[PDB]
Each structure stands twice: as C-alpha cells, then as structure tokens.
Design a protein around this ligand. Structure first.
Ligand SMILES: CCCCCCCCCCCCCCCCCCCC(=O)O[C@H](COC(=O)CCCCCCCCCCCCCC)COP(=O)(O)OCCN
Ligand SMILES: CCCCCCCCCCCCCCCCCCCC(=O)O[C@H](COC(=O)CCCCCCCCCCCCCC)COP(=O)(O)OCCN
Ligand SMILES: CCCCCCCCCCCCCCCCCCCC(=O)O[C@H](COC(=O)CCCCCCCCCCCCCC)COP(=O)(O)OCCN
Ligand SMILES: CCCCCCCCCCCCCCCCCCCC(=O)O[C@H](COC(=O)CCCCCCCCCCCCCC)COP(=O)(O)OCCN
Ligand SMILES: CCCCCCCCCCCCCCCCCCCC(=O)O[C@H](COC(=O)CCCCCCCCCCCCCC)COP(=O)(O)OCCN
Ligand SMILES: CCCCCCCCCCCCCCCCCCCC(=O)O[C@H](COC(=O)CCCCCCCCCCCCCC)COP(=O)(O)OCCN
Ligand SMILES: CC(C)CCC[C@@H](C)[C@H]1CC[C@H]2[C@@H]3CC=C4C[C@@H](OC(=O)CCC(=O)O)CC[C@]4(C)[C@H]3CC[C@]12C
Ligand SMILES: CC(C)CCC[C@@H](C)[C@H]1CC[C@H]2[C@@H]3CC=C4C[C@@H](OC(=O)CCC(=O)O)CC[C@]4(C)[C@H]3CC[C@]12C
Ligand SMILES: CC(C)CCC[C@@H](C)[C@H]1CC[C@H]2[C@@H]3CC=C4C[C@@H](OC(=O)CCC(=O)O)CC[C@]4(C)[C@H]3CC[C@]12C
Ligand SMILES: CC(C)CCC[C@@H](C)[C@H]1CC[C@H]2[C@@H]3CC=C4C[C@@H](OC(=O)CCC(=O)O)CC[C@]4(C)[C@H]3CC[C@]12C
Ligand SMILES: CC(C)CCC[C@@H](C)[C@H]1CC[C@H]2[C@@H]3CC=C4C[C@@H](OC(=O)CCC(=O)O)CC[C@]4(C)[C@H]3CC[C@]12C
Ligand SMILES: CCCCCCCCCCCCCC
Ligand SMILES: CCCCCCCCCCCCCC
Ligand SMILES: CCCCCCCCCCCCCC
Ligand SMILES: CCCCCCCCCCCCCC
Ligand SMILES: CCCCCCCCCCCCCC
Ligand SMILES: CCCCCCCCCCCCCC
Ligand SMILES: CCCCCCCCCCCCCC
Ligand SMILES: CCCCCCCCCCCCCC
Ligand SMILES: CCCCCCCCCCCCCC
Ligand SMILES: CCCCCCCCCCCCCC
Ligand SMILES: CCCCCCCCCCCCCC
Lengths: 201, 201, 201, 201, 201, 201
C-alpha cells in the first residue's frame, strides 16, 4: 500500500476550490475526451475523399476543399482542449516540487505563494476558452451548409461543391459549443468564489 | 494489499440498492458495451461508401445520403449510453469526497443527505433513457427499408437509392431496443423499491 | 501479497464442478476466443467489397448481398459466445456478494441456496448453445457455395452472383460447429454428474 | 513481494524437462510469435486485392482465387501454433489445481500421476506438428509460382492469373518450415531423454 | 511500497537544474509528443494519394511528388524529437549505473564528474535543435503553396501539380517552429544559469 | 518491494562487460526499435499500390514488382534485428536457470562456465550483423533509383516502371546502415576488451 502521498497531493492541489466544482469539472473533462475520441473523430474520416465538385478542371477540387476548410474541426478542438488543459498540468508539477522541497525543509530541521499561481492558471484557462470560441465564430460560425460556391483558380468562373455529412457535423458542433460554454461558466464561478472569499479576509 | 478502502467505497455506494439489481444492471452494462464495441460498430463501417443512387447528377448521392441519415445509429447509441452513465459517475465522485470529509471529521475529533442525490440520479437515468427512445422512434422508427426515395436538390424529380445491409441493421436495432427497455424496467423497479421501503418508515 | 481472497473466491465458485471439467472448459473458452479473434475475423473482411454480380442494373448488388447474407457469420458467433458467457458472470457476481454478506455475518457475531442457481446457469448455457445451433442450421446450413442465384427487385429476372473465399469460410464453419458440439457435450456431462451425485444423497 | 508461488509453480511444471530444452524451446516460441506477428502478417495483406487474371468474364477472378488458395498460409500457421500450444496450457492448469489440492491436504492434516500426462502432452505436440506439416505438403508444397492456370467455371477454357509477392512468400514459407522442423526435433529429443532416464529405474 | 529509490534517482538527476526549467521543459515535451501523435500525424495521411498533376504521361506524378517532397514533415519531426531526446536518456543511464557503483562502495566499506556530462548533454540538445531548424529552413522554408511546377523527366516541358491541405499544414508547421524555438530558448537559459552559478565559485 | 532479485540478475548478466558498453548499446537498441517502428514502417506502406509501369499488358506490373523487390527492406530489417537479439535472450535464460540452481545448492547445504557462453553470444551477434550487411549489399546495394527497367514475361520486350518515394527510402537506408556499423563496432570493442583483460591473467 503506497497510495497515501497521492491523497496528500490531491488534497493540497484542491485547497482553494469549491466542493461542487471538483466533481462537475472533472466529469465534464472526461465527457469531453470520450465524446471527442469515440463518436466525433469517426464522423470526419471521409471529409476530403467524399468531397465532390461539378467540374472537369484538374486541380479544382483540391483548391476548393482547401478554401472551404482551412483547418478541420476535430484538430481545432484537439488544440483547444490541449491548450485548456496545459495550465493545470503546470500547476500540478509546481505543487509537486514545492511539496518535495517542504518535506526536505521540515525533515532536516526537526497566503499568496500558491494562491496567486492558482488564480493565474484559472484566468488563463478561461482566456484560452474564450479566444478559441471567438476564432471559431469568426472563421466558420456554428453550422455547415450542403452546397459551397468556389471562386478560386484554376477553377473557371464559379463552381458548386458538395460537403459530406453536413447535418451530423452541425449537431456535433452545437454539442461542442454547449460543452465549451458550460466549462467557461464553471471556471468563472470558481474565480468569483475565490475572490468573494478573499474579500472578507 | 491495499484494496480495503475500495470495498468500503463499494459498500457505501450501494447502500439503498436491492440485492438483485446490482448483478443484473452491472451485467447489462457490460453486455451493452461489448455488443456496441465488437459486432455493432463494424456493421456500419461502409454506411456511406456502399450507398448508391440511380442517377448521373453530381452531388445527388451526398444530399440524398444526408437526408436519409441525419445521424448514424451507432453514434446515437454512444451518446445515449454516455448520457445514461454520467449520473452514476457524478454520484460516485460525490460519495468519495463525502467519505474523505467524514474521515477527516471522525479522525481529528477522536437520512436525506445521500438518499436524495441517489434518487435524483436514478430518476435522471430513466428520464434520459425514455427521451432517447422517443427521439429515435420519432426520427427513424425501428426498421430500415432497402429502397429510399429522394426528392432533394440538385437531384431532378425523384430518385431511388439503395442502402447497405438493411436486414442486419434491423436485427441489431431490435436488439438495442430490447436492451434499453430492460434497463428502463430495472431502474423503475429500483425506484419503486426505495419508495416502498420509505413509506413504512 | 493480496491474492488470497481470489483463491477463496475461485474455490467457492467451483464447489460442485468435476475435476476435469474446469480445465477442459476453460481451455476451450480460451481456444474459442483466440480462434475467433485472430484468424476467423480477418477472413470475412472483404465480404461485401469483393462480392460481385453479373448485371448492369444499379442497386442489384446491394439487395442481392443483403438477401444472401441476412447476418454475418462472425457477428452471429460473437452474439453466441456472449450469450453463452453471461450466465457464468452473473453467477460469479452473486457468489461475490453472498461471500461479502457472510463475512459480515460471521465477523460481527463472533444445500440448495447456491446449488439451484448453479444448475440453472448450466441449463441456460446449454439451452442457448442448442438454440443458436438450430437457428444457424435453419438459416444457412453448414456450407457455402461459390455461385448464388438472386431473384430480388430491382434485378430483372434472375442474376448470378459470386462469393468471396467460400472454401475457407466452409472450413472455419465446420471448425466452429465442432467447437460448439464439444462445449455442449461437456455441459451435459456436468449436469449429469451433479444430478447423479445428488441421487445418492 | 508476492512472486514466490509463481517460482514454485514454474519449478513443479518443469520437473522432468532437460536443462537446455527450457531455454531453446521458450526462445523458439517467442521467435515464432514475433515473426508471425510483425513481418509475415503484413506481407499477405494484399493477397486478393492485387490478384489479377487476364479475362473479361465477370466472376472468374473470384473463383480462380478461391481455387488457387483454399486457405491462407498465415491463418493456417495461426491454427498450427494454437494447436501446438494448447496441450501445455492444459498441463499448466492441471498442475495448478493439483498443487492447490495438495496444499489443502498437507495444511489441514498437519511416480506416474503427473509423468503420464506430461508424456501425453509432449506426444500430442509432436503429433500435431507432423500432421500440419503433412497437410501443408499435400496441399501447397513449399513454394509458389508467379503464374497460375485456372480451369473453373464460369471462366471459358483456361485462363492465366498472376500472384502477389511470390518470391517473398516463398522465402517466408521456407523459414516457417525450418522453424517447425526444429521444434519437432526438440520435442523428440525431450521424449527420448525422459524414456532413457526411465529405463535405468 | 517500493517507489523510494525512484525519488532518489529523480533528485540526483536534476541536481544542477533550475526550479522552473523542470516543469516547463517536461510539460513542453508532453505537449510536443501529444501534438505530434494525435492531430499532426493524421493530417498527412493522404499526402501522396490526393496528390494530382495535370498530364497524361505515365510516371510523371511519381517523380514530381518525389521532387516536391524529398522527406515528409512528420517523419522529419520524429527524427528531430528522437535526436533531441537521446542525450537525456544517456545521462539517466549513466547516473543510474554511477549510483549503483556508489551504493556498492559505501555499503561494502561501512565537482566535475557529473557536471561535465550534464553540460555536454545540454549543449548537444541545443546543437541538434539548431541543426534541424537550419536544415528545414534550407530545404522547405516555413510555408507550402497550393500549386507546384514540375520540370523532371519523363514529364514533357513543365507541368502543374496540386498539393493536399496546404493551409492546415502551414498552420501546423508554424506551431512546430514556435515549439522548437521555445525549447531552444529554455535550454540556452539553463546553460547560462549553470555557467553564471559556476563563476561565483 | 520485490525488485531486488532483478538487480542481482542484472549485475550477474553484465559481469564481463565494460562500463560504457552497457549504456551505449542499450540506447542504440532503443533507438533502433523506435526508428523502425515509428517513421520507417509508415514510409513503405504504399510500396506496391503506388508502383506503376508503362504498359497495357495484364500481369506485367505484378511480375515486375516481384522482380524489383524480392523482399521488402522493412521486413529484412525486422529479421535482422530479431536474429541479432536472440542470443542475448538465450544468455539471459541460461543465467536465470543457473542462478536458481546455485540458490538451491547454497541453501540446502548451509572462470569458464559462463564466460565461454558470453563470448560465443557476442561472436554470433557480430557474425549475424556482418552476414546481413553482406546480403543486403549483394542484393540491393545502398540506394534506390526512380526508374526501373523490366524484362520479365509476360511483359513484351522491356518496360519502364516507377518506384514510390525513392529519395526518402534512400535516406532511411543510409541511416540504418550507419546504425548497423555502429553496433558492429561496439560489439567488436567488447570482444577486444574481454580478450585483452584475459591475456594478463
Ligand atoms: C482508488 C480507490 C479509491 C480509494 C482511495 O481512497 O484511494 C485514494 C487515492 O486517491 C486516488 O484515488 C487518486 C487516483 C488517481 C488516478 C485514478 C484514476 C485514473 C483515471 C483518471 C482519469 C483522469 C481524471 C486514497 O484516499 P485516502 O482515503 O487513503 O486518503 C489519503 C489522504 N492522505
Ligand atoms: C478482485 C478480487 C475479488 C476479491 C475481493 O474481495 O476484492 C474486493 C475488492 O473489491 C473489488 O473487487 C472492486 C474491484 C473493482 C474493479 C475490478 C473490475 C474491473 C473491470 C470492471 C468493469 C466495470 C464494471 C475486496 O473485498 P473484501 O472481502 O476485502 O471486503 C472489504 C470490505 N471492507
Ligand atoms: C497466478 C500465479 C499462480 C500462483 C497462485 O497460486 O495464485 C493463486 C491465485 O489464483 C489465481 O491465479 C487466479 C488468477 C485469475 C486471473 C489470472 C489469469 C488472467 C487471464 C485469464 C483469462 C480468462 C480465463 C493463489 O493460489 P493459493 O495457492 O495461494 O490458494 C489460495 C486459496 N485460499
Ligand atoms: C521477474 C524477474 C526475475 C527475478 C525472479 O527471480 O523472479 C522469479 C519469478 O519467476 C518468474 O520470473 C516468472 C515470470 C513469468 C512471466 C514473466 C514474463 C512475461 C512474458 C513471458 C512471455 C511468454 C514466455 C522468482 O524467482 P525466485 O528466485 O524468487 O525463486 C522462487 C522459487 N520458490
Ligand atoms: C506518483 C504519485 C506521486 C507521489 C510521490 O511522491 O511519488 C514519488 C515518486 O516519484 C515519481 O512520481 C516518479 C514517477 C515517474 C513516472 C510516472 C509518470 C508516468 C508518465 C511520465 C511520462 C514522461 C514524463 C515519491 O516521492 P517521495 O515524496 O516519496 O520522495 C522520495 C525521495 N527519496
Ligand atoms: C526502476 C527504478 C530505478 C530504481 C532501482 O534501483 O531499481 C533497480 C531495479 O533494476 C531495474 O530497474 C530493472 C528494470 C528492468 C525493466 C525496466 C525498463 C522497462 C523498459 C525496458 C526496455 C528494454 C531495455 C533496483 O536497483 P537497486 O539499487 O535496488 O540494486 C539492487 C541490487 N541487488
Ligand atoms: C500521462 C500523461 C502523458 C497524460 C495524462 C496526464 C494529464 C494530461 C492529466 C492527469 C489529470 C488530468 C486532469 C484531471 C481533471 C481535470 C478537471 C479540470 O480541472 C479542474 O477540475 C481544476 C479544478 C479542480 O480540480 O478543483 C480540467 C481538466 C483536468 C485539469 C485534467 C487535465 C488533464 C490531466 C492533468
Ligand atoms: C476510467 C474512466 C476514464 C472510464 C471508466 C470509469 C466509469 C466510466 C465506469 C466505472 C464503473 C462504471 C459503472 C459500473 C456499473 C454500472 C452498472 C449500472 O449502474 C448500477 O448498477 C447502479 C445501481 C447499483 O450499482 O446498485 C449502470 C452502469 C454503471 C453505473 C457503470 C457506468 C460506468 C462506470 C461508472
Ligand atoms: C473484465 C470484463 C470487462 C471482461 C472479462 C471478464 C469476464 C467476461 C470473464 C472472466 C472469467 C471468464 C470465464 C473464465 C472461464 C470460463 C470457462 C467456462 O465456464 C466454466 O468452465 C464453468 C464451469 C467451471 O468453471 O467449473 C466458460 C467460459 C468461462 C465462464 C469464462 C467466461 C468469461 C469470464 C467470466
Ligand atoms: C520506455 C522507453 C522504451 C521509452 C520511454 C523512456 C524515455 C524515452 C523517456 C522517459 C523520461 C523521458 C524524459 C522526461 C522529460 C524530459 C523533459 C526534457 O528534459 C528535461 O527537462 C531536462 C532538464 C530537467 O529535467 O531538469 C526533455 C525531454 C525529457 C528528457 C524526456 C525524454 C524521454 C524520456 C527520457
Ligand atoms: C517480453 C518479450 C516477449 C519481448 C521483450 C523481451 C526481450 C526481447 C528484451 C528484454 C531486454 C532486451 C535487451 C535489452 C538491451 C539490450 C542491449 C544490447 O545488448 C547488450 O547491451 C549486451 C551487452 C550488455 O548489456 O552489457 C542489444 C539488445 C539487448 C540485448 C535487448 C534485446 C531484447 C531484450 C532481450
Ligand atoms: C451539459 C448539460 C448541462 C450541464 C450544466 C450543469 C451545471 C449545474 C451546476 C450545479 C451546481 C454547481 C455548484
Ligand atoms: C469499463 C469502462 C470502459 C471504457 C470504454 C473506453 C473505450 C475506449 C475509448 C478509447 C478512445 C477514447 C480515448 C482517447
Ligand atoms: C435481455 C434478456 C432479458 C433480461 C431481463 C431479465 C430481468 C430479470 C430480473 C430478475 C429479477 C431481478 C430482481
Ligand atoms: C478474457 C476476456 C477477453 C475480453 C475480450 C475483449 C475484446 C476486446 C474488445 C475491445 C473493444 C470493446 C470495448 C470498447
Ligand atoms: C476440439 C477437439 C476435441 C475436444 C474434445 C475433448 C473432450 C475430452 C474430455 C476429457 C474428459 C473430461 C472429463
Ligand atoms: C505471450 C502470449 C501472446 C498472446 C498473443 C495475443 C495476440 C493478440 C490478440 C488480440 C486479439 C484477440 C483478443 C480479442
Ligand atoms: C533456427 C536456427 C537453428 C536452431 C537449431 C539449434 C538447435 C541446437 C540445440 C543445442 C543443444 C540442445 C540441448
Ligand atoms: C522492449 C521490447 C519491445 C517488444 C516489441 C514488440 C512489438 C509489438 C508486436 C506486437 C505484435 C506481435 C504479437 C502478437
Ligand atoms: C486521461 C488522459 C487521457 C490521455 C489521452 C491520450 C490519447 C492517446 C494518444 C496516443 C497517441 C499519442 C502518443 C504517441
Ligand atoms: C549514430 C551517431 C554516432 C554514434 C557513435 C557514438 C560512439 C561513441 C562511443 C563513446 C565511447 C564508448 C566507450
Ligand atoms: C513517454 C514515452 C512515450 C513513448 C512513445 C511511444 C510511441 C509508441 C510507438 C509504438 C511503436 C514502436 C514500437 C514497436
């Protein structure tokens, strides 16, 4: 039995968090990863192979697909989740090393230090979430249409192209938007709780 | 040997459940996941590649497939199982944190609190199951036909399209319906048992 | 070292079984799963992609393949093995919970109960095996021919279609039949042994 | 530290084996599995997709491929290795249960039994190896030619077909033959050793 | 519980490193591997299958693709990360063996040795990073264009070819460049810290 | 904590090896396996599917590809590494069994034996490496050209065929050659060290 120090680490990491935030946020993270890995990823498999355009011009399909989709939704979401997750990993590593140093100090010699970093990490999580949402809104919006109009060389004049599985992708896009909004709300709630408990001194 | 606290956690989680519900429900969950992962998923692999329509119009197959299948059955079932499973995970996390707090209290100082949450979780499981069943009934029904009639642009007039493996998919749809009904019945039985043991005080 | 309770569980599960049945049945289960997972599954990979028919009618291949194979052999066998395996898992869970309850009783306070369930589980294993064998015999038989005659709309008149790897699939079908028969015989032997030891009182 | 009983089990399993047989046979088994899993399996991937025949007759390629290859070499070898391996697993299970029973006896109450089964297992290993070698020799031989002549309906007269990667497959076939011969020789040596140590009493 | 010597090893490995370098560099390594494995690798899947050229000359596409891409970006990055990682593994092995030898010495008999190797390893990490960046700049630059002009035999005169997913690949190239620059900066900072603490004696 | 006997085994295995050989050779093995598994294997995926020839003769591509590549480079390298690795596994097994026997002897009864086998194993490692290098030099050389000339039936006269990714494969071939040479040099150094320490007695 060697799982005790893990309990101590967990307790020290979540010193300033609310009772409900732990459960809700962790389960949301698990839900996010499972949804992205099982169902979402497979629906984008034939994103380019099933993409078709009405033309005989060689090379037009390539450029029209590139123009329609500068970056895939799934890879964008992977980047988003990695960026939202990195700060917590940094905080965990910092806490681990601090605990080791404190053990050294208090063995050989028989607020603000960690609160500030925690606040910064939460702020950066929220900032990254908002930035990714804004970028997605600017680039794509939150829906996909069946027919796309392409006006890029070497295609002559304008051509019509047809997407793959637009409705299913729209449904999943809405799901991901809802998940992101919930996560942002929870993080904002945590920030307000910490600041409102700090005011009373 | 460090598996004792796991036994305590398991005992405290299942305080209010019946003797048979544990076994039947857990085995049903295992059966559900195995069936979805091994046999069901592979049968839908060529759902769009083997989909064909009788026409020379470019883009008609894409739109007709999109209209026929707004969302795949397998991904719908994955969403259903995740939604049905989340509440139990939330309850487990809550119980774990409560047990840690109680250990702190009863070490340093040498009904209704948890019953309500358990009842709420069971109710939400049943609610999600019923909602998913109703949505599936409204959208698809519980069978698939070999020939589909498509009347969507840019297809001219109406066209005929042909599905892949309709009979096998019908069989698996019936299987999944039966499994869902059994799960709903077991949850309702658990609710009735708890309420009937609460009446006698 | 924390593997003792596992030994106790194993001993209590196999109280009423014969000496040889354990080894033979467990090794048969391992053989079944390995054979199904390694060699059998790969041979059915191109079951529909390599299926061909002599015709120019669009949609005829889809319907003819659907008629020829209402359900794939591999998925049928997966269903069979899952159904044959579930009762033992149920019995194991029941025994585990009973043992925990008995430990509680005999710690705090310092035939027929389990025999009946064991008999029922063995009976249901045999029943499922026989039912699956009968269904397979009725639907397919125990061989596959190279040429198939199709008389389904929209195909005009009758058409000829050609299967993929008929001889190899026939060989594997015979193998699976032999395995199923051996398993059924072993289960029947166990039933006879228990009933013949119960007669002498 | 709970690895002691494993050492006892290993010692009791290999009571009657020679000093060198252990190492050589175990390393040969590891070599066999690695070779089959890493290099051999990938070389047969496009066995049917790259198979081609000179004809316009629909369905001729299917039947000609089926006639040329009643069963794939890789799946045949998988069956061979499973059959050669099962007896040792049976013997291990028997020894495990016997050891548990003996522990019970010698705790509560503070040659020929196992030798015969070991001899039978070794004999069956050798028998299966020889049978598989004979079957392979009768069906295929130990080489593959680039051009195959097909005289099966519905192909008219005779047609020429061309295999994929014949030389590489020939090389691997020779490798597998050598491995099988070495294994058979080692098993025969073990049999002779046991019988020659039994003669002196 | 047998995780203590691992703690000692970790402490002795990071004797001369700064407090922040540990966390930042380790998290950067994890980020690098995750990004390369999840999102980046899949975007290059159809790098050659979707590559197209405007010509009827057989063999022109092969040679034009070979000329355009002497080596794939993903495999280049895999080589880069392996080369950047090997020195730390060498240092860890050296430290492990030195610790074992010191344990022998100090049990049986009841700066510069390791600092130099650490400095050399850090220097080589930075050197490899810079070399790979320079090679990539010389060969490809840091962007990809949609249209490529090919003037290689047997293609007649010059031909136009079209890439797959140029914009997404450009985005990921920029990401990887930023990551490499950050890693180089951190290593240089570590070198300066060690040399500036060595000056004061 | 049960990792002590592993330390003893490691110490006894490396009794006669030099201080640096351990680290360098082990890291080289890890580098070899990682390089072969991650980057090299994927570059040969479309070795036959992207192989093309200028002709209308059916069957010519098959025979020309077979003649050009009697065996794939990746599978050749897998065979090489397995052959180079087997002797060390044999030596480890022998040492393990010898240690068990010595424990028996020295518990119940409260150079040349192993040196010779170690020398033989090292010699065989070097021999296999040299043999594989010579075979590769004789068959292929150490580069690949873009255009191949084929003069095999049923192709008429001579035909031109075009390879896939020749430059990248050439680069990786050079890398593997360098790795093999380094490994051979290290093994020769170990042999010279042991023989030069044996001369002084
Ligand atoms: C585990 C079983 C729970 C029993 C348990 O109490 O374990 C706790 C270990 O913490 C933990 O359970 C931490 C486990 C962390 C990883 C396990 C989950 C793997 C998957 C996670 C995915 C990402 C989220 C110890 O608690 P204690 O009562 O002994 O208190 C000690 C305070 N000094
Ligand atoms: C395990 C072997 C069973 C023996 C056993 O009794 O283990 C129990 C641990 O509980 C458990 O066995 C919990 C194990 C939970 C995970 C194991 C299953 C993995 C796959 C599950 C898939 C999802 C369902 C301890 O019981 P005890 O007698 O010591 O009582 C302690 C009450 N304080
Ligand atoms: C394991 C090594 C065998 C040594 C051994 O005796 O372990 C036994 C544990 O039982 C067991 O060995 C049970 C292990 C169950 C899982 C291991 C197999 C995994 C794969 C199985 C696939 C499905 C079949 C303990 O026995 P003991 O002598 O201490 O007696 C205790 C009676 N109170
Ligand atoms: C393991 C490290 C070796 C050290 C060691 O001695 O472990 C032995 C355990 O046996 C064993 O090492 C058995 C391990 C069996 C599985 C490990 C290999 C996994 C992959 C195998 C592939 C199939 C072949 C114990 O030996 P001892 O000195 O304590 O003697 C005890 C006699 N009562
Ligand atoms: C693990 C849970 C943390 C608790 C803990 O303190 O474990 C430390 C073990 O070090 C470690 O935690 C080292 C673990 C190394 C591998 C675990 C990570 C796997 C994935 C890594 C990917 C590559 C990066 C022991 O620390 P202590 O307090 O007992 O001090 C001992 C100083 N003598
Ligand atoms: C492991 C963490 C290192 C700490 C450590 O000292 O472990 C040593 C175990 O040896 C070992 O660390 C052997 C581990 C062997 C496998 C671990 C690597 C897996 C991947 C390898 C790929 C192939 C290469 C014990 O050493 P000690 O100080 O207690 O001395 C005991 C001499 N009686
Ligand atoms: C082993 C390596 C290569 C990958 C797996 C390690 C990390 C990437 C994992 C381990 C624990 C995970 C965390 C577990 C749960 C949370 C929930 C959530 O964070 C919080 O709940 C913070 C507030 C709180 O916990 O009280 C956001 C994701 C996060 C940080 C996870 C992010 C990813 C983490 C750091
Ligand atoms: C490790 C993480 C990333 C994924 C795996 C963890 C959970 C998703 C698993 C662990 C235990 C599972 C549960 C085990 C068994 C049950 C049976 C069933 O629930 C009940 O039986 C509730 C009533 C009772 O147990 O008495 C419904 C599924 C559920 C909750 C499972 C849902 C999924 C759970 C929570
Ligand atoms: C971890 C979960 C998600 C999947 C793996 C757990 C079960 C599906 C496994 C564990 C042990 C297995 C059993 C091990 C061996 C047997 C042999 C055989 O049953 C018997 O031999 C019963 C009679 C006897 O054992 O004496 C039939 C399969 C069965 C029950 C297996 C069925 C599948 C079981 C229950
Ligand atoms: C099990 C084998 C087959 C593969 C996995 C083992 C190694 C390849 C791993 C184990 C730990 C890893 C290291 C963990 C973290 C670091 C962070 C970073 O190095 C440092 O931070 C050095 C400075 C410091 O740690 O203070 C660069 C990658 C590196 C060395 C990693 C490189 C890859 C390592 C050596
Ligand atoms: C678990 C099984 C199925 C596969 C994995 C086990 C073996 C194939 C591994 C375990 C340790 C490995 C060895 C670890 C390191 C070395 C380095 C190198 O050998 C030496 O360094 C010998 C000289 C020395 O170590 O001092 C060549 C590869 C070799 C023997 C490896 C070959 C493959 C080995 C034997
Ligand atoms: C996705 C479904 C909606 C999830 C939002 C649930 C948020 C409820 C928070 C409960 C109170 C937290 C303290
Ligand atoms: C008993 C719990 C079962 C969990 C099922 C997990 C399925 C595997 C999904 C792996 C891909 C998603 C994570 C990247
Ligand atoms: C699917 C097959 C049908 C499963 C339904 C079994 C329900 C029986 C419940 C037994 C009594 C529970 C207390
Ligand atoms: C001994 C028990 C064997 C269990 C077989 C499991 C097969 C692997 C299936 C993995 C996919 C389904 C879960 C997502
Ligand atoms: C498949 C090969 C045939 C297996 C049948 C073996 C059954 C023999 C049972 C031995 C006695 C059991 C008590
Ligand atoms: C040392 C034993 C090796 C076992 C080989 C297992 C091969 C992996 C097969 C996985 C698929 C079959 C189970 C679903
Ligand atoms: C395959 C290469 C040939 C392997 C044959 C080696 C057999 C030698 C047996 C040594 C003595 C055993 C006691
Ligand atoms: C350190 C040892 C590495 C072992 C490499 C194993 C490669 C994985 C091969 C898995 C397929 C073959 C077994 C079925
Ligand atoms: C709970 C943490 C989940 C981690 C997700 C990892 C996904 C698997 C990615 C594997 C490929 C990248 C490493 C090579
Ligand atoms: C591949 C890069 C070159 C590796 C060769 C390094 C050999 C150096 C050996 C150092 C001294 C060993 C005792
Ligand atoms: C933390 C270390 C990560 C190691 C990455 C390994 C990637 C998986 C590669 C597996 C194929 C190569 C071995 C056969």
């Amino acid at each position: 039995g060697d799982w005790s120090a893990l309990g101590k680490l967990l307790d020290k990491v979540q010193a300033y968090s609310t009772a409900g935030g732990k459960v809700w946020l962790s389960v949301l993270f698990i839900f996010r990863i499972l949804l992205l890995g099982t169902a979402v990823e497979s629906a984008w498999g034939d994103e380019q192979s099933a993409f078709r355009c009405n033309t005989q011009q060689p090379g037009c399909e390539n450029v029209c697909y590139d123009k329609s989709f500068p970056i895939s939704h799934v890879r964008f979401w992977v980047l988003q989740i990695i960026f939202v997750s990195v700060p917590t990993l940094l905080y965990l590593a910092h806490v681990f090393y601090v605990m080791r140093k404190e053990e050294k100090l208090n063995k050989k010699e028989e607020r603000g230090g960690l609160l500030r970093t925690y606040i910064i990490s939460i702020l950066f999580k929220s900032i990254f979430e908002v930035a990714f949402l804004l970028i997605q809104w600017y680039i794509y919006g939150f829906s996909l249409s069946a027919v796309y109009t392409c006006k890029r060389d070497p295609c002559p004049h304008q051509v019509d192209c047809f997407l793959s599985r637009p409705t299913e992708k729209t449904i999943f896009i809405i799901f991901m938007l809802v998940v992101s909004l919930v996560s942002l709300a929870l993080n904002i709630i945590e920030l307000f709780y910490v600041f409102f408990k700090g005011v009373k001194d």
